[PDB]
Design a binder for this molecule. Sequence first.
Ligand SMILES: CCN(CC)CCN1C(=O)CN=C(c2ccccc2F)c2cc(Br)ccc21
Ligand SMILES: CCN(CC)CCN1C(=O)CN=C(c2ccccc2F)c2cc(Br)ccc21
Ligand SMILES: CCN(CC)CCN1C(=O)CN=C(c2ccccc2F)c2cc(Br)ccc21
Ligand SMILES: CCN(CC)CCN1C(=O)CN=C(c2ccccc2F)c2cc(Br)ccc21
Ligand SMILES: CCN(CC)CCN1C(=O)CN=C(c2ccccc2F)c2cc(Br)ccc21
Lengths: 307, 307, 307, 307, 307
Amino acid sequence: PVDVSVSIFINKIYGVNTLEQTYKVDGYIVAQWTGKPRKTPGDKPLIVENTQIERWINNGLWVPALEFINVVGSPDTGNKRLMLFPDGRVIYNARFLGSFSNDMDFRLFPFDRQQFVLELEPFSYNNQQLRFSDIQVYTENIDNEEIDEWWIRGKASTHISDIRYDHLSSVQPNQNEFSRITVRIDAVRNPSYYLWSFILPLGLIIAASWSVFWLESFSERLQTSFTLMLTVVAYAFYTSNILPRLPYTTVIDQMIIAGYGSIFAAILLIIFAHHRQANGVEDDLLIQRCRLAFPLGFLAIGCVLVI
Amino acid sequence: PVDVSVSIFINKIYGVNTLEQTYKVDGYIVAQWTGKPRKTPGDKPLIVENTQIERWINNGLWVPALEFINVVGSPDTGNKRLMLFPDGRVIYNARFLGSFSNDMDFRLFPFDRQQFVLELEPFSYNNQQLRFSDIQVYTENIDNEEIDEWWIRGKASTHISDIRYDHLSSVQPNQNEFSRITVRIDAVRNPSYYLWSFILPLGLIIAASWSVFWLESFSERLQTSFTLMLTVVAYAFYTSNILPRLPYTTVIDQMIIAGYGSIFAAILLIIFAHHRQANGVEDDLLIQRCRLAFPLGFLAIGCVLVI
Amino acid sequence: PVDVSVSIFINKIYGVNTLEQTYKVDGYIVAQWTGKPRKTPGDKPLIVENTQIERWINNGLWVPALEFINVVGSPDTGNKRLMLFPDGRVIYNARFLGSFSNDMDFRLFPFDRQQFVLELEPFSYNNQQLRFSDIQVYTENIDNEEIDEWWIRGKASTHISDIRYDHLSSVQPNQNEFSRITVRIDAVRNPSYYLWSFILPLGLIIAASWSVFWLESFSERLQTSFTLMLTVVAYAFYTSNILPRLPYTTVIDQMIIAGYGSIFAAILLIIFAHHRQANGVEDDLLIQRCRLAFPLGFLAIGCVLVI
Amino acid sequence: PVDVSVSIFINKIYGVNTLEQTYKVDGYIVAQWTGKPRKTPGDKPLIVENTQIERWINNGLWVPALEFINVVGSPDTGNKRLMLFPDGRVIYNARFLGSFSNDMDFRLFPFDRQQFVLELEPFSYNNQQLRFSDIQVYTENIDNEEIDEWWIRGKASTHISDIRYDHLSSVQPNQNEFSRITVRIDAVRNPSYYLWSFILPLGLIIAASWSVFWLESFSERLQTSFTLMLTVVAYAFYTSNILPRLPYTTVIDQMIIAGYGSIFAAILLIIFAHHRQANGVEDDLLIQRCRLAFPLGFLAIGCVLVI
Amino acid sequence: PVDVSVSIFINKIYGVNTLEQTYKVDGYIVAQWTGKPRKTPGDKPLIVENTQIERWINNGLWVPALEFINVVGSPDTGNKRLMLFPDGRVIYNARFLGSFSNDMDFRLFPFDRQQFVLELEPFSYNNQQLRFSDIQVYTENIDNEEIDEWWIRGKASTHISDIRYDHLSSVQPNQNEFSRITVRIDAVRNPSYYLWSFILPLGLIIAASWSVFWLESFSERLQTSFTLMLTVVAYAFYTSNILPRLPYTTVIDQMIIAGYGSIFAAILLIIFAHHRQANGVEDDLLIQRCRLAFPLGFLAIGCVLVI
Ligand SMILES: CCN(CC)CCN1C(=O)CN=C(c2ccccc2F)c2cc(Br)ccc21
Ligand SMILES: CCN(CC)CCN1C(=O)CN=C(c2ccccc2F)c2cc(Br)ccc21
Ligand SMILES: CCN(CC)CCN1C(=O)CN=C(c2ccccc2F)c2cc(Br)ccc21
Ligand SMILES: CCN(CC)CCN1C(=O)CN=C(c2ccccc2F)c2cc(Br)ccc21
Ligand SMILES: CCN(CC)CCN1C(=O)CN=C(c2ccccc2F)c2cc(Br)ccc21
């Protein structure tokens, strides 16, 4: 079993695709394994760059193909390097950029708790042929959190484990176990933009929506709630066009539904106040003065949604 | 006839293009055929990776080109592997990512019933030269349905059949039959977002649209229906900008037309009530109180749309 | 002159770019020419796939480069195949995906009549060196027209002609004629979405725009036309955002201009009714009742759009 | 000094990127230079296509790399051709598609005057090594101007000049001059869409904005100007979403600012008319009837904007 | 230690991605190092272009891989050139286009201060193997500042430094230092578009928002502020759709929040004026005439935001 020491150097985690549950990762892979001793020019370790690496493999150099399990398609591999030592150790260094996938929950947006995962595994050689000895990640990202979209919390979580495939029958009997490196980087979304530019103005719309009961005439009370309805429609459109596309409702999306409900409940109460009478224009002095009845009731219903 | 055993491993089905009727599929193809016995180093099966596969074909290795019939262009092929056994059998393993096409009906959106199809067929060799012995699909997708956009129902449906091409005249007479693998994965769309953020608020708009008949003055009844008209225009824009682009009307699209119709029917009645008179301001004592006449009449028209 | 028999197999015509006048075509090219007799293994025709085709050309195989005249850049060529026969005939089969250009008129949108053209011509060899013997197209597209964006009407139109280039002076004197295959597939756009979701609601906006004259007060008649103006602005935005981008006005675009004109003509007449008086509040009992004068005048302008 | 005769064949100029100041050009490059006499099969000129061109260079064929100075990145090169003559002359023919850059002014949009420039220069060989003998452009574009976005005015402007680089010190002393071909194609933008769908309706908005003074009550005069303000906001959004993104204001953008100003000037005058009094509601007869004072005054300010 | 002289020629800095903190840079890299003296044909320096460069490396030419540290993925390399001199010196010239990353603060938008950075470093050879002797940048960009999106201040700031990597343990002990070239081009954003098309009209919206107190009736004062609220919602949407996407609020974004606050403060004051009474309709003659109280108070709060 060939012992391979891996080292991942994370440079940038960007471009989060909410619908595809994808994120772009730029970095470097450093794989090291000790092979048969070589006769390098002089005695110092020989360096093999990009094109020449392929030429050495053709001659007989064993360079194992290590695949990213969670990568979407094939990653953009930059500069390649092979450092061949006279004692036998071979070091493979290459820059990479790939789109990685992971199960991502954006239900409690914009207060997300997401972890960026990286999964490495040899494509052809099993645990008895190729084994991952040790792995260390270097996230050289520090300071200027208020400028970046995401706030990296942990240093990096690593786990080397043997993955067993079910496959059913096939040609390989017992040899069905592969060593896999799992890298996890926990992060929290910056809600400073969404709180001030989306939560705060929406809150004022719903608050001003309750000020419709302070009107004197029934015609005034009803016609204003139609403008109020149009304001939430105009805001729902403003939200959905800028906010990320998702197959489920978020906290901001739920606030919009609560806004529509608040206006529709007001529409029903304004009609009920004027028509549930004993003469014709007998507006219930208590139900017309619900200026404090459901506005605090909205806070009660709003806190039920949190539970 | 060379018997080839195929095995498809589905990893992710994402990125549904509604207009192009396309979907992205990430997975692995495993093709196995038994050839002439080889002399592998030692006696254990020899592994050939990526670049070296092309070198072996140049020497004389028969690797048949198996084409994806329903793929859009050329797929992104990842790591390639050739496992050559001393007994003869050859196993080809390669990761793939391609955009696949299939006839997709999105008429009853967001309650769609779609099946993701995969079609494999040899590009050059016919059924008498190359035959597909057996095929098995492994959809290792389970749990977290409420997070994913689509809900995979069935395990995977397979069908190996001989496809005969019409062509007319040409050079090949009887040899015009090819073995084809057809993989079908049935799925249902998650309507939780579209029901709460699009169906539910739209329903409230139409419900509040009928509350225009609770107004006393004709001037009030007419001017409010113009604001109501503008609300549906603002909503129709909010819908079409977020909803997928299609060459036919959906359930949500039909609801919008019903909204325009309900306001236009009101506009005609509000004019008729005030102008069809015996004195001048004689608003037909019963037609003006149609606060329950067409709102349930809309539901009756809404039940006719079920047919 | 080498006689080459071509056969095009159309799979999918999609992705129409209105501004660039481009459309994506997926299919197969089958070129056949009779050469010098060969000694194939055994006696059965030899099959050469992808990578190996390039190896045969290096040895001395003549494979002519046939260029798509109307293609935008270079097309995505899939699997390649060379079928070499012992009698001499050579068959080249390859899957292709390319963006093709043609003069496209979208003036009478959404009732467009467009033809998808394909132009094939040898890149280096003239009509005296390479001649196209015959060409046949196979459009294996049938049923489910209501699901597809475009409705293919004609089966396929083909034309082999000799194209003469002007060039002026140069090195080649008489040899300036090349054989060209021109494939034409006529299609009609599906107007079901645009008629119900764009033509029908817009018609109701203009129809409800003429209901402004049924108002009693001049203040009511003027203030409502400002809301009417805002409704067309909101609709013009809804139209232009979803509708394809073009450097000329369509039928739907012309309808929007007619809407703006109808409201502006109303604004002028409402002012003219109130102020062309003999006291101050002398509103013309016939011009204020133009409730039928210009609404049918709009229909007369609509009939002028036909001429 | 090698004399090279170049011939550019323009097929299509499309996809103008206003922010990047880029445009896509599809065509053919024909370069001719006389070399040492060759022994071609028979005596007729030998044709070398695509892959085989690289093989001939490896043997010792001198094919100079001619770079497009104003191209953005690397262009999409189609079919390549080398016509080797027994007398010595070598003709290089290749199809190209590239994104070209040029200093573009879109200040007086949609009535822009833009010229599409193409710059060719040898990448390695200077004017003493490689000289451009002559250049001729063939713009085979004619008729259907009303369908195309841009209207080509001139045939083609060509200029061969020696460009001297400053560089400072370096290794090359006197040898710092390179021959450069500059191709210029002048074109005027089709304003038919922008005049009818953007200039004309905007003009009606500002014209109807002045009709706010024809209202009787001060409350009516003020509340209507708020709807007028909202109409320009809705139009400014409709304009900016469809119109190209630029780092400077256009004629249409300036018209929008003039619209905001006209409404804000009206707001100030309506307040001043009512509050600058001697009793309370002493609305200045002349200042309230400014229905003709600033509407023509706007035309006077509008004429200053042109001159 | 090999002394390498580098020269960067900047052609265009465009396409600033605010969310990814990326910018596209087009230019040329000129690397020079003195090797072992060669024997070139004749005596003049030998030129090696594109494909042939790879052929020379295979034979034994040492061409070091110089990587762009801050580049996003792999850059689009154009034409490549190797000028081999008989005295020994080797000059590598190649055109490049890459997306470069740098820490970018867009908090005080549109009055941003940014610097475009370029970082070069050898991928395999350390400071003891490869050393950067000198670096000079040529920004041939001058005049037409009012047309370009950015105004460049300096010529080009350069800094050659030895970067030491932490790595921890590994195989390399002392040899962990690499020479790095840092290029900085300081720039200031052109705010002429954003000041006239976004700051100026928004200022008029807030200024006209304070004109709601000039209304006589309480019903008029309240209903108009709802239209005012809808105007800011329509403007907030117009702003966010055109303005760049960022994870933090800008000066323009803060102005929008101030607009919502000004209307909400007015809503509370209009309700307080009418309901805080001694009879019923006792509107406080001073608090209703706050037509000058908070409008200048808004300017005071506005001046605090600047500090
Ligand atoms: C020769 C026996 N073979 C079973 C077909 C070994 C296990 N195997 C494969 O050969 C095909 N490739 C893989 C495989 C190997 C590495 C990474 C991803 C894979 F799908 C595989 C996958 C699963 Br799930 C189950 C078995 C499996
Ligand atoms: C020599 C075998 N040949 C008869 C001439 C098979 C028929 N054929 C082609 O040769 C071109 N290529 C194909 C073809 C073959 C395999 C896969 C996809 C193809 F388009 C083809 C397509 C159709 Br539809 C009808 C016939 C057909
Ligand atoms: C050697 C003859 N040559 C003189 C330079 C003229 C033929 N020619 C070309 O060699 C470049 N390619 C083409 C050409 C060849 C095949 C298909 C399309 C083309 F534009 C061409 C086009 C025109 Br228009 C005029 C000349 C012409
Ligand atoms: C060969 C000697 N050399 C000086 C080291 C010539 C000058 N030169 C270059 O070598 C790099 N390439 C080029 C050069 C040549 C052709 C096309 C584009 C280029 F940047 C160049 C550009 C400028 Br500005 C100034 C000098 C210059
Ligand atoms: C054998 C010593 N080893 C240290 C782990 C080599 C140095 N190295 C790499 O091989 C991986 N690539 C790099 C590296 C090399 C060139 C440019 C950027 C890099 F991250 C690197 C980065 C850091 Br931080 C630390 C070590 C380091």
